[PDB]
Amino acid sequence: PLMVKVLDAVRGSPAINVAMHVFRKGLTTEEEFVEGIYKVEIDTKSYWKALGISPFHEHAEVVFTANDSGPRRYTIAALLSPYSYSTTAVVT
Amino acid sequence: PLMVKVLDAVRGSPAINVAMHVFRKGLTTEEEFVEGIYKVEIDTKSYWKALGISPFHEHAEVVFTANDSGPRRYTIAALLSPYSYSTTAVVT
Amino acid sequence: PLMVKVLDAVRGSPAINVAMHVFRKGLTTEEEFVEGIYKVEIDTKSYWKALGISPFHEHAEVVFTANDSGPRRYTIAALLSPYSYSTTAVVT
Amino acid sequence: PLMVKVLDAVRGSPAINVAMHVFRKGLTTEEEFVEGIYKVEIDTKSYWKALGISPFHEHAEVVFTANDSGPRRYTIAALLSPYSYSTTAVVT
Amino acid sequence: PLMVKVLDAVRGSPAINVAMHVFRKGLTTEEEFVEGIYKVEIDTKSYWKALGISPFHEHAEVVFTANDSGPRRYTIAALLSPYSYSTTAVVT
Amino acid sequence: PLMVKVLDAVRGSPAINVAMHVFRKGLTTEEEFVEGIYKVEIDTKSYWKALGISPFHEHAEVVFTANDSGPRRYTIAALLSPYSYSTTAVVT
Amino acid sequence: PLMVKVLDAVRGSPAINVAMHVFRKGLTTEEEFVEGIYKVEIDTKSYWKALGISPFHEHAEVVFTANDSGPRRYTIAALLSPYSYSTTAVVT
Amino acid sequence: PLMVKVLDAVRGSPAINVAMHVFRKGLTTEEEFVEGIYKVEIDTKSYWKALGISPFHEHAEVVFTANDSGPRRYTIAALLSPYSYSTTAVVT
Amino acid sequence: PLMVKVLDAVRGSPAINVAMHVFRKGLTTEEEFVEGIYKVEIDTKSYWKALGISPFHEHAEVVFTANDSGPRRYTIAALLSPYSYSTTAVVT
Amino acid sequence: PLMVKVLDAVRGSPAINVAMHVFRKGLTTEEEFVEGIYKVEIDTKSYWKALGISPFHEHAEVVFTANDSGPRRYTIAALLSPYSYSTTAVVT
Amino acid sequence: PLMVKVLDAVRGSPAINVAMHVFRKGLTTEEEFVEGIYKVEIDTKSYWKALGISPFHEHAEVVFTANDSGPRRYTIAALLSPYSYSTTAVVT
Amino acid sequence: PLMVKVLDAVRGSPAINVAMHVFRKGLTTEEEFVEGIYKVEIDTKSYWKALGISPFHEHAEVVFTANDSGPRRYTIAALLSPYSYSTTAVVT
Amino acid sequence: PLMVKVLDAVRGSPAINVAMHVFRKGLTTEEEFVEGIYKVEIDTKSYWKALGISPFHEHAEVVFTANDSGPRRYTIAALLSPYSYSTTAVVT
Amino acid sequence: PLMVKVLDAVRGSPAINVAMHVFRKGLTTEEEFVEGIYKVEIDTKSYWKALGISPFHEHAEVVFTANDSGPRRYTIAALLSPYSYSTTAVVT
């Protein structure tokens, strides 16, 4: 007799971010990547990746180089932040 | 007797972001990538990726180079943020 | 006796972003990419990707180079953010 | 006895983005790409991609080069953001 | 006894974006690409792609070069954002 | 006789971030990456990764170099912080 | 006879971040990475990682170098901090 | 006052093999082959020869195969052997 | 006052093999082959020869195979052997 | 006052093999091969020869195979052996 | 006042093998091979020879195999052996 | 006042083997091979030779294999042995 | 006043082997091989030889195998042995 | 006033083996091999040899194996042994 009641009545003007779910029940490589409900990626970097069985097995000569420079100003505000009657401002 | 009641009545002007889902139930490589409900990717980078069984198996000579520069100003506001009666501003 | 009631009555002028779904019940390579409900990709980059069984198996000589420069100003506001009675402004 | 009731009555002028779906039930390569409901891609880039069984198997000599420059100003507002009675403005 | 009731009555002038679906139940390469419901791609780029079984199998010498420059100003507003009684403006 | 009642009635204008989910029930490599409900990644970096059985097994000569410079000013505010009647400001 | 009642009635304007979930019940490598409910990663770095069985097994000569410099000013405020009637300000 | 006197007088019937000589005094490839005085080549073989600057410079894939069989009976006698009053015989 | 006197007088029938000589005094490849006075080559073989500057410089994949079989009976007699009053015989 | 007197007078029938000489006085590859006076080569073999500057410089994959079989009976007699009044015989 | 007198007078029938001579006086590879006076090579073999500056410089993978079998009966007599009044015989 | 007198007079039938001589006076590789006067090589073998500057410099993987079998009966007699009035015999 | 007198007079039939000579006077690799007067090589073997500066400098993996079997019966007699009035015999 | 008198007169039939000579006078590798007057090598073996500067400098993994079997009957007689009036016999 499952039952879920969220936010059954709302008099007013909220700022809601609702997420949910109700559940009721030889050689091989694999990359499973299952994502979620909310996500905010900014400037994500995944430079190098070698995935599998026996990569670079013999005599592999790998030269990696990742120089990072440059003034990266992330002036951020109100991420995943539902607001009400509020004043979000970004100035420069 | 499953039952889900979300936001059954809303008097007013809310800023909602609803997401849900109710459930009731030889050699091989594989890349499964199943996505979610909400997503905001900005400047995501995945430079290099070797996926499979035995890549670069023998004598692989890999030279990688990722120089990153340049002033990247991310002046961001109100991501995944449903707002009400509010004032979001970005100035420069 | 499954039952879902979302937002059954709405007196007013909201800003809603609803997403849902109710469910009731030899050599080989594969790239499955199943997407979701919402998505906002901006300047996404996937430079290099070698996917499969035994790529670059022998004597592979790979020279990679990714220089990144240039002032990329992302002046962003109100992504996936349904708003009501509000004032979103971007100025330069 | 499945049943879904979303937004059964709406007195007013809302800005809704509804998406749903109710469910009730030798050598080989494959690229399945199933898309979803909503999507907003801007300046997406997928430079290089080698997909299959044994690409570049022998003596492969690959020289990659991706220089990125140039001031790319993304002045964006109100993506996937149904708004009501609001004022969205972009100035330069 | 499936049943779906969305937006059964609407007194007013809403800006709706409704999408739904209800469902009730030797060598080989393949590229399946099944698309979604609402979509907005802008400046999407997929420069290179080699898909199949054993491409570039032997002695493949591949020289890639992607220089990107030029000030690309994306001044965007109201994507997938049904609005009501609102004022969307873009100035330069 | 499961039962969940969250936020059953809301008189007022709250700034809520709700997330929930109720549950009721030879050689091999694998990378499972299942994501959560909320996430805000900014400037995440995963430079190098070698995942699988016996990578770099013999005589592997790997030279890594990651120089990091450049004044990165992250001037951030109100991440995953739903606020009400408030004033969030970022100035430079 | 499970039962959960959170925030059953809210008269007022609260900034709450409610995240909950009720539960009621040969060679091999594996990387499981299951994520949680909330997360805010900023400038996370995972430079080098070599998970697997017998990586670098013989004669591996690895030279690593990670120089870190550059004045990174993280001027941050109000992370995962839902506030009400407050005043969050960042100035430079 | 050079002077050479060979075999100045010969009373008799000699079998002579006389040979003499008295002497008194950018990119480029070259094969000089100056021969001498006497020579008896039999079944000489020079199967393969790549002569020059940078032959087979790149990706050259050369498959060579020289099977040698067959009963080659060289029943030889009196090569470069001037005889006198003698009896040379070859029988089978 | 050079002077050479060989075999100045010969009473009789000799079997002579006389040979004499009196002397009195950018990129580039070269094969000089100057021969001698007497020579008897039989079944000489020079199967494979790469001569020059930088042959097979890159990725050269050379498969060589020289099987040698077959009863080769060299029944030889009196090579470069001037004889007199003698009896040279070869029988089978 | 150089003087050379060999075999000045020969009464009789000798089997002589006389040989004499009196003497009185950027990138580059080279194969000089100067031969002499007498030579008897039989079944000489020079299977493989890479001569020059930087042959097989990179990634060279060379597979060599020289199987030698077959009864090779060299029944030889009187090589470079001037004989007199003698009896040289080869029987089978 | 040089002077050489060899075999000035020969009464009789000798088997002589006379040899003599009187003397009176950037990147680069080179193979000089100067031969002498007498030589009898039989079944000489020089299977493999890499000659030059930096052959096989990088990643060279060389597989050599020289199986030698087969009854090789060298029944030889009187090599470089001038004989007189003698009896040289080879029987089988 | 140099003077050389060898074998000035020979009454009789000798078997001589005379050999004599009177004398009176950047990167680089080189193979000088100067030969002498007499030589009898039989079944000489020089299987493998890497002669030069930095051959096989990096990651060279060399597999050598020289199996030797087969009854090789060298039944030899009278090599470089000038004989007189003698009886040289080889029987099988 | 040099002077050499060898074998000035020979009454008889000697078996002589005379060999005499009168004398009166950046990176680099080199193989000088100057030979002598007499030489009898039989079944000489020089299997492997890496001659030069820094061969096999890095990560060289060399597998050598030499199996030597097979009844080799060297039934030899009278090498470099000039004989007179003698009887040399080889029987099987 | 140098003077050498060897064997000035020989009445008889001697088996002599005479050998004489009268004398009266940056990085680098080198193999000088000067030979003598007489030499009889039989079944000489020089299996493995790395002569040079810094061979196998780093991580060299060398596996050597020399199995020696096979009856090798060296039934030899009269090497470098000039004999007179004698009887040399080899029987099997």
Residue numbers in the entry:
A (entry chain J), B (entry chain H), C (entry chain F), D (entry chain D), E (entry chain B), F (entry chain L), ...: 11 to 35, 57 to 123
Text of the article:
TTR fibrillogenesis follows a downhill polymerization mechanism, in which dissociation of the TTR homotetramer and partial unfolding of the monomers initiate the amyloid aggregation cascade.
Here, we structurally characterized vitreous body fibrils from a patient with ATTRv Val30Met amyloidosis and showed that they are polymorphic and mainly consist of multi-protofilaments. Using cryo-EM we obtained the structure of the vitreous body ATTR Val30Met twisted-dimer consisting of two intertwined protofilaments. The model was built in the cryo-EM map at a spatial resolution of 3.2 Å (for statistics see Supplementary Tables 1 and 2 and Supplementary Fig. 4). The ATTR fibril proteins in each protofilament had identical conformations related by a twofold symmetry axis (C2 symmetry) along the fibril long axis. The protofilaments intertwined along the C2-axis into a left-handed helix with a helical crossover distance of 154 nm, a helical twist of –0.55°, and a helical rise of 4.72 Å, as determined by the layer line from the power spectrum from reference-free 2D class averages. The continuous Coulomb potential regions in each protofilament were modeled with two fragments of ATTR—the N-terminal fragment comprising residues Pro11–Lys35 and the C-terminal fragment comprising residues Gly57–Thr123. In contrast, each fibril protein in the twisted-dimer has 11 β-strands (strands β1–β11). However, the major structural difference between the two fibril proteins was the folding of the first 11 residues of the C-terminal fragment, residues Gly57–Ile68. In vitreous body fibril protein, these residues form a long β-strand placed diagonally over the core of the fibril protein.
